[PDB]
Design a protein around this ligand. Structure first.
Ligand SMILES: Cc1ccc(-c2cc(C(=O)O)c3c(c2)ncn3-c2ccccc2)c(Cl)c1
Ligand SMILES: [Zn+2]
Length: 345
């Protein structure tokens, strides 16, 4: 039961060393690219956005896959929603004036200069071997034929969040209305994920703020009396998907699913189960089942709301085809109904 889950968590700890050295390598490449991007008049204000829950500037999206975001302070920004998509927007408003097409800031034009500067730069430093693979993420780098890092350019807006987020981040009953107000005072980000000229709202930087401050109790997981299993359930959900994707690699049925889908479902379960007593460490097996059952429901109903934009369906036909969702539904059901044989030794 839960002893199989606890065995999985123990095994995962054994690759901490490989992960930290890989993240060190990513960190070096990113610092170098940050230096050259700052030379360009367009990207002078660029900087690293702190998104990682364990490492600072580096998010781990899968084994040997890392995620980095470059933020660009762009003030006096005005948004125009693209055709009721709730998540995609035209950006309107001098350093960036080169990227204008009318009153609109072109995502494709800015991404193209971003790409070109990075592609130039990875040639020079022969300290490590870095190539460019493959539109968000802007750049995927492959380091040493092993480690891949997705680099995402993000405009930073310090304005109030767009109205499409008004009913999102539904944490009031869990983390309190006070915390939700404070979080909604932080900046938001636009990335050039095209629905073209459209940008997508991004709140990835909020994850670290909640995952490591995750209890109804302010001292959840700060002492021996308050140990919950929230983080371990998220780890197990990510590992479930990673393992399924590897086993179904012959026909790549699951290519479209990612840890972002897993995380979103997991934080919806945290909303539904707001009390720390619903995440007691002794209850790991039931808590994990809660998480998997909700993910299964999202798959079967083909509905997974963006955590911040409730009318944006991560599982829409526009984003993931029906056959892929039907397929993973079937595999998750099987795993859940059979006590997760994908976790067997
Ligand atoms: C509590 C909490 C906090 C943050 C997130 C979060 C949000 C986004 C987003 O789209 O705003 C994320 C992400 C994680 N990882 C990736 N993206 C992302 C970013 C841009 C485009 C597509 C995808 C979640 Cl799920 C829950
Ligand atoms: Zn806790």
């Amino acid at each position: 039961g839960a002893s199989k889950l606890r065995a999985v968590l123990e095994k995962l700890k054994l690759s901490r060393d490989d992960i930290s050295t890989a993240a060190g390598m990513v960190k070096g490449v990113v610092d170098h690219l940050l230096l050259r991007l700052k030379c360009d008049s367009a990207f002078r204000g660029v900087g690293l956005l702190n998104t990682g829950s364990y490492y600072e500037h580096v998010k781990i999206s899968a084994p040997n896959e890392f995620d980095v975001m470059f933020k660009l302070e762009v003030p006096r920004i005005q948004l125009e929603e693209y055709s009721n998509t709730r998540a995609y927007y035209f950006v309107k408003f001098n350093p960036l004036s080169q990227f204008l097409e009318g009153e609109i800031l072109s995502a494709s034009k800015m991404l193209s200069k971003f790409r070109k500067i990075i592609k130039e730069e990875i040639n020079d430093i022969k300290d490590t071997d870095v190539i460019m693979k493959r539109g968000s993420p802007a750049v995927t780098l492959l380091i040493s034929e092993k480690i891949s890092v997705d680099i995402t350019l993000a405009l930073e807006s310090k304005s109030s969040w767009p109205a499409s987020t008004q009913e999102g981040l539904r944490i009031q009953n869990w983390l309190s209305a006070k915390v939700r107000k404070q979080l909604r005072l932080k900046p938001f980000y636009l990335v050039p994920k095209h629905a073209e000229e459209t940008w997508r709202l991004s709140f990835s930087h909020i994850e670290k703020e909640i995952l490591n401050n995750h209890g109804k109790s302010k001292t959840c997981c700060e002492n021996k009396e308050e140990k919950c299993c929230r983080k371990d359930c998220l780890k197990l959900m990510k590992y479930l998907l990673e393992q399924l994707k590897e086993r179904f690699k012959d026909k790549k049925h699951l290519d479209k699913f990612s840890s972002y889908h897993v995380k979103t479902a997991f934080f919806h379960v945290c909303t539904q189960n707001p009390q720390d007593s619903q995440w007691d460490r002794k209850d790991l097996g039931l808590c994990f089942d809660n998480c998997v059952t909700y993910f299964l429901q999202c798959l079967r109903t083909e509905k997974l709301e963006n955590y911040f934009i409730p009318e944006f369906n991560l599982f829409s036909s526009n984003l993931i085809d029906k056959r892929s969702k039907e397929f993973l539904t079937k595999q998750i059901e099987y795993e859940r109904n059979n006590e997760f044989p994908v976790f067997d030794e």
